[PDB]
């Protein structure tokens, strides 16, 4: 708004050559930039664009204190878990939204970039935890969790991989997910476009 | 999209060392991806090395980058060579993109 | 490593579609997370830019005029409309996120 001429680097989030594991996701902060949500809308949203608390149509004129971009890769059937009120392996152990979230979740099919014929095994996720994960919490440690009936200082009585291959139907294809979390009017707003 | 800027050229005598500059535009990162690539006079292009490592060639060409700016530091420990090549700075984070510079040695 | 571009050069007629190809003994994966094959364009006096291919059908990059394809042991790049802009040398490369080996280049001249 107040003579900001910088443009928001959405391309440095959305066009990235490498994406993070579900846990240890990339978290970038955008500030002191003019928003332009024309680009992130009906250009390349592909599969989905679901917002909570805002009407995407007028998103360019709202003005946020800060915008945070959480970026990661998940299996396609799990896309529905990146949403307020959801449960499951991603929602409970890897990435959780607050249920009063005011941002936008954008996702698309990356099978052509991430899947390999032999299988892309570089994407990991958390399967086990002693308790559920809190919103935006990150925990990247390894605990050889599967004690079963005996505490272990060995292996088992940790984390698991995804297997991404171009032919595993549809629900098993990888998806790139970007979550734009909005910090609205907690301090005078800094990021908007036309206003 | 992301542009790179490099010093246009360098010239120095054999036995001396040089450093080649590069900076990228951008705002933030968790990590780094980049490559130094060389184009010998009249040949195709060769990899010099990735984030400070080697392409298989070691010795004269070594390097150490700090960040997204001064992301460069290609260093030649010795100019006693016929390596009067064009060097390129390659961006590896959004869309691959190249910029380059000419480094020579006089007689 | 083979990385060899077959044609020396293409026809110079403006408006005439033409194609080039690169052969290898490295036809499948080279990379760590994806594929094994790219094309670069170097205009005289300029740094190269990127055109993108894969093992299974795929094609990307910034311009939408060009088309990549391949089969067997040979990778192909073709140009449809020829505006005489595409004058320079086209090269084949095998890395991805991963660095690379590289081909010899082929000359495209348009008159
Ligand atoms: C992200 O990149 C696109 C262009 O990238 C293309 O599409 C991607 C999905 C991928 O396949 C790439 O390999 C492709 O090259 C940017 O789109 C540009 O938007 C401006 C808006 O004014 C338009 O003028 C350009 O013509 C578009 N470019 C192309 C090639 O069509 C997009 O802006 C980038 N940023 C974001 C946040 O998406
Ligand atoms: C975006 O595209 C949908 C159709 O996919 C259309 O109904 C909608 O009106 C478009 N939005 C805007 C702001 O034009
Ligand atoms: C935001 O984008 C929509 C797209 O239809 C446009 O109509 C609207 O005028 C833009 N907002 C402002 C404040 O101009």
In chain B, the number of structural domains is 1
Q: How far apart are CA A73 and CA B33, in angstroms?
A: 19
Contact A120 C58 (CB under 8 A): no
Given resolution (angstroms):
3.9
Locate A57 and state its tokens. 């149509």
Q: How far apart are CA C102 and CA C99, in angstroms?
A: 10
Signed CA dihedral, A172, A173, A174, A177: sign only: negative
Is A194 a pocket residue for ligand 3 (Cβ < 6 Å)? yes
Residue A188 belongs to a domain:
no
User: Which residues does residue A71 pair with via DSSP β-bridges, in sequence order?
Assistant: A26, A178
Breaks in chain A after residues, C-to-N cutoff 2.5 Å? 157
Question: Looking up tokens 């990991």, which residue turns up?
Answer: A124
Between the CA of A39 and the centroid of ligand 3 the distance, in Å, is 12
Q: Which of B61, B59, B60 is nearest to B48 (CA)?
A: B61
Task: Name the closest-CA residue to atom 36, ligand 1.
Answer: A11
Domain span at residue B55 reads 4-104
Contact call for residues A162 and A123 (beta carbons, < 8 A): yes
Residues of A in contact with B27 (CB under 8 A): 9, 12, 28, 30
The string of DSSP letters for A55-66 reads -GGGGGGS-BSE
Contact A28 B26 (CB under 8 A): no
Residue A139 belongs to a domain:
yes
Q: How far apart are CA C68 and CA C76, in angstroms?
A: 6
A51 contacts chain B (CB < 8 A): no
To which H or E segment does residue C21 belong?
Answer: strand C18-23
Reported in sequence order, the residue ranges of C53-105 that DSSP labels E, i.e. its strands, are 60-61, 67-71, 74-79, 88-93
Domain span at residue A79 reads 11-183
Three-state DSSP state, B100 = strand
The number of residues making up chain C comes to: 111
Which own/partner contact pairs does B37-42 have at CB distance under 8 Å and 24+ positions apart?
A: B37/B87, B37/B88, B37/B90, B37/B98, B38/B83, B38/B85, B38/B86, B38/B87, B38/B88, B39/B85, B39/B86, B39/B87, B39/B88, B39/B100, B40/B83, B40/B85, B41/B84, B41/B85
Q: How far apart are CA A172 and CA C97, in angstroms?
A: 23
User: Which residues does residue C77 pair with via DSSP β-bridges, in sequence order?
Assistant: C20, C68
Contact B44 C104 (CB under 8 A): yes
Q: How far apart are CA C103 and CA B44, in angstroms?
A: 7
Count of beta carbons in the 10 Å neighbourhood of residue A40: 22
Reported in sequence order, the residue ranges of A76-173 that DSSP labels E, i.e. its strands, are 104-109, 124-126, 159-161
Residue A193 belongs to a domain:
no
Q: Which of C76, C73, C74, C49 is nearest to C63 (CA)?
A: C49
The number of residues making up chain A comes to: 195
Q: How far apart are CA A159 and CA A97, in angstroms?
A: 21
Q: Which of A186, A195, A194 is nearest to A64 (CA)?
A: A186
Contact C56 A113 (CB under 8 A): no
Q: How far apart are CA A175 and CA A64, in angstroms?
A: 27
Q: Which domains does chain C have, with CATH numbers?
A: 16-108 (2.60.40.10)
To which H or E segment does residue A14 belong?
Answer: helix A11-14
Q: How far apart are CA A145 and CA A129, in angstroms?
A: 8
Q: How was this structure determined?
A: cryo-EM
Residues of C in contact with A120 (CB under 8 A): 33-34
Q: Which of C108, C90, C102, C86 is nearest to C30 (CA)?
A: C102
Residue A72 belongs to a domain:
yes
Q: Which of C109, C103, C93 is nearest to C5 (CA)?
A: C103
Contact call for residues C33 and C39 (beta carbons, < 8 A): no
Residue A35 belongs to a domain:
yes
Locate C84 and state its tokens. 């005489």
Q: What CATH number did the domain enclosing A103 receive?
A: 3.30.70.1840
Locate A118 and state its tokens. 């032999």
Q: What CATH number did the domain enclosing B84 receive?
A: 2.60.40.10
Between the CA of C85 and the centroid of ligand 2 the distance, in Å, is 36
Residue A133 DSSP one-character state: P
Locate A82 and state its tokens. 């990146």
Residue A142 belongs to a domain:
yes
**Integer angstrom CA distances of residue C51 from A15, A123, C54, C79:** 16, 26, 11, 12
Q: Which of B92, B23, B41, A114 is nearest to C99 (CA)?
A: B92
The string of DSSP letters for B7-76 reads -SEEE--TT--EEE--EE--S--SS--EEEEEE-TTS-EEEEEETTS-SS--SSEEE---SSBS---EEE
How many CA atoms, within 13 angstroms, populate the side-chain half-sphere of residue A29? 6
Question: Looking up tokens 């292009």, which residue turns up?
Answer: B45
Q: How far apart are CA A43 and CA A164, in angstroms?
A: 26
Dihedral of the CA atoms A163, A164, A169, A170 (nearest 10)? 120
In chain A, the number of structural domains is 1
Locate A51 and state its tokens. 């917002």
Kindly give, in sequence order, each residue whose CB lies less than 8 Å from that of residue B75, ignoring residues fewer than 6 positions away: B17, B18, B19, B20, B61, B62, B63, B64
Q: Which of A81, A105, A110 is nearest to A95 (CA)?
A: A81
Contact call for residues A19 and A135 (beta carbons, < 8 A): no
Q: Could you tell me the end-to-end alpha-carbon distance of chain A, in angstroms, rounded to an integer?
A: 6
Signed CA dihedral, A19, A20, A22, A27: sign only: negative
Contact call for residues B77 and B60 (beta carbons, < 8 A): yes
Q: How far apart are CA A92 and CA A70, in angstroms?
A: 17
B54 contacts chain C (CB < 8 A): no
Three-state DSSP state, A81 = helix
Reported in sequence order, the residue ranges of A87-173 that DSSP labels E, i.e. its strands, are 104-109, 124-126, 159-161
Three-state DSSP state, C78 = strand
């Amino acid at each position: 708004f107040p003579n900001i001429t910088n443009l928001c680097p959405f391309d440095e989030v959305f066009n990235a050559t490498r994406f993070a594991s579900v846990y240890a996701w990339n978290r970038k902060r955008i500030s002191n930039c003019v928003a332009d949500y024309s680009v992130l809308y009906n250009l390349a949203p592909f599969f989905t664009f679901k917002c909570y608390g805002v009407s995407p149509t007028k998103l360019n004129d709202l003005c946020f204190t800060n915008v945070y971009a959480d970026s990661f890769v998940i299996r396609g059937d799990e896309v529905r878990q990146i949403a307020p009120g959801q449960t499951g392996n991603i929602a409970d152990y890897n990435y959780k939204l607050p249920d009063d979230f005011t941002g936008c979740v954008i996702a698309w099919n990356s099978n052509k970039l991430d899947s390999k014929v032999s299988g892309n095994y570089n994407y990991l996720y958390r399967l086990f935890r002693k308790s559920n994960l809190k919103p935006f919490e990150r925990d990247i440690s390894t605990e050889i969790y599967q004690a079963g009936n005996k505490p272990c200082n060995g292996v088992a009585g940790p984390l698991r991989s995804y297997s991404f291959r171009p032919t595993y139907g549809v629900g098993h294809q990888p998806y790139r997910v970007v979550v734009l979390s909005f910090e609205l009017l907690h301090a005078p707003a800094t990021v908007c476009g036309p206003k | 999209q992301v542009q790179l800027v490099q010093s246009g050229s360098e010239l120095k005598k054999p036995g001396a060392s040089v450093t080649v500059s590069c900076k990228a535009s951008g705002y933030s990162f968790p990590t780094h991806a980049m490559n130094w690539v060389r184009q010998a006079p009249g040949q195709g292009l060769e990899w010099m090395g990735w984030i400070p490592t080697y392409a298989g060639f070691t010795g004269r060409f070594v390097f150490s980058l700090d960040t997204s700016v001064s992301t460069a530091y290609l260093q030649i420990s010795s100019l006693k060579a016929d390596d009067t090549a064009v060097y390129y700075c390659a961006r590896g984070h959004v869309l691959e993109w190249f910029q380059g510079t000419l480094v020579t040695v006089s007689s | 490593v083979v990385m060899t571009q077959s044609p020396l050069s293409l026809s110079v007629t403006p408006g005439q579609p033409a194609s080039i190809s690169c052969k290898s003994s490295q036809t499948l994966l080279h990379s760590d997370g994806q594929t094994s094959f790219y094309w670069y364009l170097q205009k005289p006096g300029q740094s190269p830019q990127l055109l993108i291919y894969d093992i299974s059908s795929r094609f990307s990059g910034v311009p939408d005029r060009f088309s990549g394809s391949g089969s067997g042991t040979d990778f192909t790049l073709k140009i449809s409309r020829v505006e005489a802009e595409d004058v320079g040398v086209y090269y084949c490369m095998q890395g991805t996120q991963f660095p690379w080996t590289f081909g010899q280049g082929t000359k495209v001249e348009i008159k």
